[PDB]
Design a protein around this ligand. Structure first.
Ligand SMILES: [Ca+2]
Ligand SMILES: [Mg+2]
Lengths: 739, 134, 492
């Protein structure tokens, strides 16, 4: 009954029929060469191991901070336990032994904690870095200090882009585990290394380094999907007796009409500039969605179409006279004595936009839940909407601009942000104007959409420093995204959906807090809106990855602070901040940002509006500056990184479960310790606070004990004993709350 | 009734995990794996009963509502005093150890409970004796 | 590269001190009234969070002009072995600052009985040890060395003895906690004399003057009433050493004794007691004493005693405003206020010396290591004359130093390739020498290019260094000295 006609899978690459990776500059054709990720990372790890060896043989071991040596030793143990070769693992452990001796000798307490970590997880360095030691790049510090042989341009570029932390040289399972665990409750990780002049944010570098690791997705649509199954033309087997006695209004280019059954019949005329194809695609898409309402579990009250045909322009012009904005609608319609009309029936609330200020906050929460649920279900199906709100790289606003460009560091100024979501395609009852949808494959191929809007991503990245004078090519880690651009545009689509949700809620707040005076009431409205936005991000994660909603919300609130998002939405989305002078503005920014540098601008404020370029509509951010809403951007990156990191972690978990099962069935006859290491890794690669994965790993550990009886379980009794205790507790609470 | 909602969330999480293709339907090739991951480890014949009688459509895959129906059917057999006894005798050491330990583990392992809930449980109660008083 | 305002641990240390002791009410029944600023309530109005934060900032400032003076090449004090305050390693400063957060965490009330004083400091030491042992994993390996050092700082906090002049960790805590209590001590010149003499012995006249002036700025930024300096006040002087006064010997001089190998000795201390013509010493009488007015530069100088501006009524409005109770109940806000006050006190002396488009303009370039050393030498030699003067105006010396040593003027009379993003200089050339440009008021033709900008410095606009900084190492493995300049509308 319930299932999605699209399925995810792996591919060789997306680099089929893209623009050739050549940049044209005043008669020079510069070829753009990628820097492979998974190979430069491995070369850096090898240089790290060699430099650790040179450290140990240099006896300068006493000239390193004790926590830094602890990090070195823990990383060496974890990396060793990630390797499979006997020679490499033995080499890594023979490297880590002298550091272990040094720790247990000089700093007994540090070692007392380190052994606690080692017996608690198989990759200890990921439990040792859920704090502000992750900003300390021990790897690169050592490589710079002791490996004196200069790095090649590939390693140099990798270091330069990823100098932020040291979790950027981890192998895929260790890094994915660390990224997923950084959101766990007991983690104090905040991707912000605030030193005395910088405040380096790298919440986007985590996502970039995660994407550069994944293998290119492709979504395969079923044969009977809406964009694969094809149906014939639509017959005008029903003509609406269109009568001016029942018109209610003109919504943009749509005539409304009453119904004695309390429903509303709308007629959308052919908008000027586009053909009948758009109206028929809207008709067919609406009919398809209404046909598969039960399967999709879509919530929107969807517009049941009745027909699509043509009527004479005279009739439309003659019925429209009794309106308010007749002239504007007359200018919106096309110039032709006959025009194309699409007729649908929708509930009355289908036309009051989501951000209409005449609905109480509870109804706003319900409608936002409906719209986010429906957006992301239809994204799972493979139907993306690229024009929910005309937020106008070719003019489009990229919600994840850092991933999709070379040397773009913060989000962009949402010019006329309240204008953008004025006629948004999100309505109080659900979604609307389903016509301009786009099958998901249009991100994983070189469609006209992808070629037009994201040309920079597909053509590779250029900058005058990327140019190697010797080889005459631009060697860039960004160009590698050519193979992977489908994942980047997928995440950008999710971030766009949530950005439009945020701007709609913000427009609602701006429109409601004009008519309210008691400041506690205004801040209560804005706090409820911040709650709704965070809950919508949690709903996106729950729908896209299966993580329960509460756990996803907790994993978000660990990352994007809700109170600062409150304060920034309440501050930069109302004209009230335009009244204040310079110093009062300064002190209010000290409160909204609260631990991170303020939004600094030089442009002049127009009274009663705020920041602007025209002088009569409000911007979200000064001209040619970034968006002042940090915690919104942190929320977007937290959401997309949670989704992609959960997917990659689950890929790794299955890649390890296959290796475990090939042992328990004898297909790889090895020692007992090999199987025990396999099960330990399979335990460490489970989602944070995801119990059933740990229960499965415990079952596999019991089976491995049964197959290898005489094996020592001394090093694996602790964590699995804890897992058994937790499972017993789980069933105890189940029985206890049953009654 | 149906079942506790917190089991519905866990079922949905596990089902969406073991769906390698992200389509909302699982093939029986790893239905056993998800079932053992939910405290249900049946032999290939016991589950083969359902591989026979599971798929109403017949396509060879299980949709999520059918999966919930499967779990509701299979939750009326294993849930008994056996699991409760196994949970009781997994801490330490003569059938009556302590209640402070139980109150401690109820607040940090698994979905944590409140101090008031632990106090109510302690006043309700001797592991064997307290287990059979509910 | 380390400071108070961006630490995330000292910040959390002060956060813990506010959450457990500084934000908890007085319980001693001696001046225990929680003041009410606006709608908000402050428990420790005298010795609350603002006091701790000002003390930490004083520690940083004292050590900062200590190393400043060391760069100037004058003579500092000695801690029983060749070394001075300027020789404080940054992690030692971090240790001192974590110690200072709890130095007042045990004050049940303002009462200063010696036994009660000792009890309060014992409670403060116990609270400090309880905190460190609670976050022991993150502090003993890296911040401190061993539990013995934590015990040493606990000893310094509790301070069973009174040998504050023993180790730098002693001075930068006791002097810092002592000089903060100038805002409340009613006879101003006596206390300021005592503190100025007690701290100049460590550093020097100019740096102590700078410390006190920036202390006034800290007071302003934290909404604390600033005491006026009255060099000719007729109030009777009291010696801050203990609590006594100076009675005159009825003719023109106080009670003066005589040591061996000396004809005359300084003033003799007596308790406030019966006079008669045995009058006391007035403050004006105390200041113009030739034996003391040759070392205290403030003799004969006066200060505003308030913001040079808005009147007494508006000033009183500001003092009782909400932000006064916000600095008392928010570590983040008070730290931000102090940081901006420090930046202004760091760049305002430059404007003081020289009478008078985005703000920050990073401009990176690659330079040889020997040239970077020879440039940092001659840029620190220009930073180490910009002490924020309070009594003695030394504008000509720093102006001549800036004018004659125009070796850091190799960025004007030409175009530029600037931007306004740190990473965009790290991410393109990853230069080993960044030139951050601070210019809040015009003075730069910061025309956009298109993102990034491109500046042009006129002849009548100079650049003056502010704080040379070393920021890690480049991609190719060499240090990245990120300088910082300020733009001066210099008609000269
Ligand atoms: Ca499937
Ligand atoms: Mg712009």
């Amino acid at each position: 009954k319930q299932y999605y006609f699209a399925r995810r899978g792996e591919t060789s690459t997306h680099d089929t029929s893209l623009p050739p990776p050549v940049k044209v500059l005043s008669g020079r054709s510069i070829p753009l060469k990628e820097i492979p990720f998974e190979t430069t990372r491995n070369e850096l790890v090898q240089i790290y191991l060699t430099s650790v060896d040179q450290l140990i043989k240099s006896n300068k071991l006493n000239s390193i901070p004790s926590q830094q040596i602890a990090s070195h030793y823990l990383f060496l143990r974890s990396l060793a336990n990630s390797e499979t070769d006997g020679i490499k693992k033995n080499q890594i452990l023979s490297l880590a032994k002298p550091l272990g001796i040094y720790l247990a000798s000089k700093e007994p307490h540090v070692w007392k904690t380190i052994n606690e970590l080692i017996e608690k997880s198989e990759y200890p360095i990921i439990h040792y870095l859920k704090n502000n030691r992750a900003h300390s790049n021990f790897m690169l510090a050592l490589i710079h200090e002791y490996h004196k042989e200069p790095l090649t341009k590939n390693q140099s570029a990798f270091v330069q882009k990823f100098r932020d932390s040291s979790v950027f040289l981890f192998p895929n399972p260790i890094y994915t585990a660390w990224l997923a665990h950084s959101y766990d409750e007991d983690s104090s990780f905040n991707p912000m290394f605030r030193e005395r002049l910088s405040t380096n944010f790298y919440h986007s570098t985590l996502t970039d380094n995660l994407l550069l690791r994944t293998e290119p997705k492709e979504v395969t649509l079923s044969s009977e999907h809406h964009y694969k199954k094809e149906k014939g033309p639509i017959d005008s087997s029903f003509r609406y007796q269109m009568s001016s006695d029942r018109l209610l209004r003109i919504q943009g280019r749509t005539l409304l009409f009453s119904t004695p059954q309390n429903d509303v019949v709308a007629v959308k005329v052919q908008k000027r500039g586009e053909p009948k194809s758009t109206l028929e695609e809207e008709f067919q898409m609406a009919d398809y969605l209404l046909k598969h309402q039960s399967r999709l579990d879509v919530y929107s009250k969807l517009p049941q179409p009745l027909g699509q045909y043509s009527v004479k322009k005279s009739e439309i012009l003659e019925i429209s006279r009794g309106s308010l904005d007749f002239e504007r609608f007359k200018t919106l319609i096309g110039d032709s004595k006959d025009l194309e009309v699409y007729v649908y029936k929708a509930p009355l609330t289908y036309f009051t936009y989501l951000h209409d200020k005449n609905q109480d906050l509870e109804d706003l929460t319900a409608s936002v839940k409906t719209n986010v649920h429906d957006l992301f279900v239809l994204l799972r199906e493979g139907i993306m909407f690229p024009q929910l709100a005309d937020i106008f790289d070719k003019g489009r606003y990229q919600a994840l601009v850092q991933l999709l460009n070379v040397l773009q560091f913060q989000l962009g100024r949402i010019d006329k942000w309240q204008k953008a979501v004025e006629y948004v395609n999100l309505r109080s009852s659900g979604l609307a104007d389903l016509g301009d949808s786009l099958p998901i494959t249009s991100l994983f191929t070189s469609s006209d959409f992808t070629k037009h809007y994201f040309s920079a991503l597909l053509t590779g990245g250029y900058h005058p420093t990327f140019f190697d004078k010797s080889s005459g090519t631009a060697n860039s880690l960004f160009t590698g995204k050519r193979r992977l651009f489908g994942n980047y545009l997928y995440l950008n689509t999710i971030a766009e959906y949530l950005l439009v949700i945020q701007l709609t809620l913000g427009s609602y707040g701006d429109k409601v807090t004009r008519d309210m005076m008691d400041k506690p009431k205004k801040e209560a409205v804005w706090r409820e809106l911040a709650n709704v936005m965070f809950t919508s991000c949690a709903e996106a994660i729950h729908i896209m990855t299966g993580i329960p909603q509460s756990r996803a919300l907790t994993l978000l609130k660990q990352r994007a602070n809700i109170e600062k998002h409150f304060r920034q939405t309440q501050f930069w989305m109302t004209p009230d901040y335009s009244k204040l002078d310079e110093d009062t503005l300064q002190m209010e920014q000290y409160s909204i940002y609260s631990g991170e540098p303020e939004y600094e601008f030089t442009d002049k404020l127009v009274s009663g509006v705020g920041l602007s370029v025209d002088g009569t509509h409000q911007d979200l951010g000064g001209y040619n500056r970034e968006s002042p809403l940090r915690e919104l951007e942190k929320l977007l990156y937290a959401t997309v990184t949670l989704i992609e990191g959960t997917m990659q972690l689950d890929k790794e978990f299955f890649k390890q479960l296959q290796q475990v099962e090939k042992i328990l069935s004898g297909e790889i006859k090895t020692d007992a310790n090999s199987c025990f290491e396999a099960v330990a890794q399979l335990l460490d690669l489970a989602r944070p606070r995801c119990h059933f994965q740990k229960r499965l790993v415990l079952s596999y550990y019991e089976e491995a004990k049964l197959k290898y009886p005489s094996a020592p379980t001394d090093a694996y009794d602790s964590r699995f004993q804890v897992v058994a205790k937790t499972n017993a507790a789980i069933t105890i609470q189940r029985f206890w709350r049953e009654t | 009734d149906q079942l506790t909602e917190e089991q519905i969330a866990e079922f949905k999480e596990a089902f969406s995990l073991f769906d390698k293709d992200g389509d909302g339907t699982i093939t029986t090739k790893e239905l056993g794996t998800v079932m053992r991951s939910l405290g249900q480890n049946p032999t290939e014949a016991e589950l083969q009963d359902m591989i026979n009688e599971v798929d109403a459509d017949g396509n060879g895959t299980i949709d999520f509502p059918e999966f919930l129906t499967m779990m509701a059917r299979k939750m009326k057999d294993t849930d008994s005093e056996e699991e409760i006894r196994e949970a009781f005798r997994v801490f330490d050491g003569n059938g009556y150890i302590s209640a402070a330990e139980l109150r401690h583990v109820m607040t940090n392992l698994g979905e944590k409970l409140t101090d008031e809930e632990v106090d109510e449980m302690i006043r309700e109660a001797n592991y064997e004796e307290f287990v059979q008083m509910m | 590269g380390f400071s108070l305002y961006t630490d995330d641990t000292v910040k959390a240390a002060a956060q813990y001190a506010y959450d457990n002791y500084l934000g908890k009410p007085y319980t001693g029944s001696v001046e225990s009234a929680p003041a009410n600023f606006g709608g908000r309530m402050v428990y420790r109005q005298h010795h609350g969070l603002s006091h701790t934060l000002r003390t930490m900032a004083y520690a940083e400032l004292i050590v900062e002009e200590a190393r400043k003076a060391k760069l100037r090449g004058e003579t500092l004090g000695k801690f029983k072995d060749g070394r001075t305050i300027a020789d404080v390693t940054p992690q030692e400063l971090k240790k001192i600052m974590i110690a200072q957060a709890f130095f007042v965490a045990g004050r049940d009330d303002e009462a200063s009985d010696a036994k009660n004083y000792q009890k309060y400091h014992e409670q403060s030491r116990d609270a400090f040890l309880k905190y460190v042992k609670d976050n022991e994993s993150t502090l003993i390996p890296d911040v401190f060395k061993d539990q013995e050092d934590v015990n040493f700082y606990a000893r310094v906090i509790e301070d069973k003895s009174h040998d504050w002049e023993s180790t730098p960790a002693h001075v930068l805590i006791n002097q810092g906690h002592m000089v903060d209590l100038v805002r409340v001590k009613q006879p101003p010149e006596s206390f300021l004399q005592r503190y100025f003499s007690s701290m100049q012995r460590w550093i020097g006249s100019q740096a102590t003057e700078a410390v006190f002036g920036i202390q006034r700025q800290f007071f302003h930024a934290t909404y604390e009433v600033v005491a006026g300096f009255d060099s000719d006040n007729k109030e009777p002087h009291l010696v801050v050493s203990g609590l006594g006064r100076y009675v005159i010997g009825e003719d023109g001089q106080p009670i003066r004794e005589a040591p061996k190998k000396g004809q005359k000795e300084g003033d003799l201390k007596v308790f406030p007691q019966t006079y008669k013509n045995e009058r006391l010493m007035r403050v004006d009488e105390f200041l113009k004493l030739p034996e003391i007015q040759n070392t205290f530069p403030g003799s004969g100088k006066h200060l505003q005693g308030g913001m040079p501006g808005m009147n007494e009524m508006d000033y009183w409005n500001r003092l009782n405003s909400l932000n006064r109770a916000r600095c008392e109940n928010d570590v983040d806000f008070c730290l931000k206020q102090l940081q901006t006050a420090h930046d202004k006190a760091k760049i305002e002396p430059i404007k003081q010396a020289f009478q008078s488009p985005p703000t920050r303009l990073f401009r990176g370039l690659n330079l040889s290591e020997e040239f970077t050393k020879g440039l940092i030498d001659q840029a620190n030699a220009m930073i180490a004359n910009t002490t924020e003067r309070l009594f003695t105006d030394h504008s000509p010396e720093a102006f001549k130093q800036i004018k004659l040593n125009d070796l850091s003027k190799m960025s004007g009379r030409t175009n530029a390739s600037t931007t306004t993003e740190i990473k965009l200089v790290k991410e393109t050339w990853d230069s080993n020498v960044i030139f951050e440009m601070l210019d809040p008021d015009g003075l730069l033709h910061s025309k956009q290019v298109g993102s990034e900008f491109s500046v042009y410095l006129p002849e009548d606009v100079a650049l003056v260094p502010v704080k040379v900084t070393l920021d890690g190492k480049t991609q190719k493995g060499e240090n990245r000295y990120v300088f910082t300049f300020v733009a001066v509308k210099s008609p000269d």
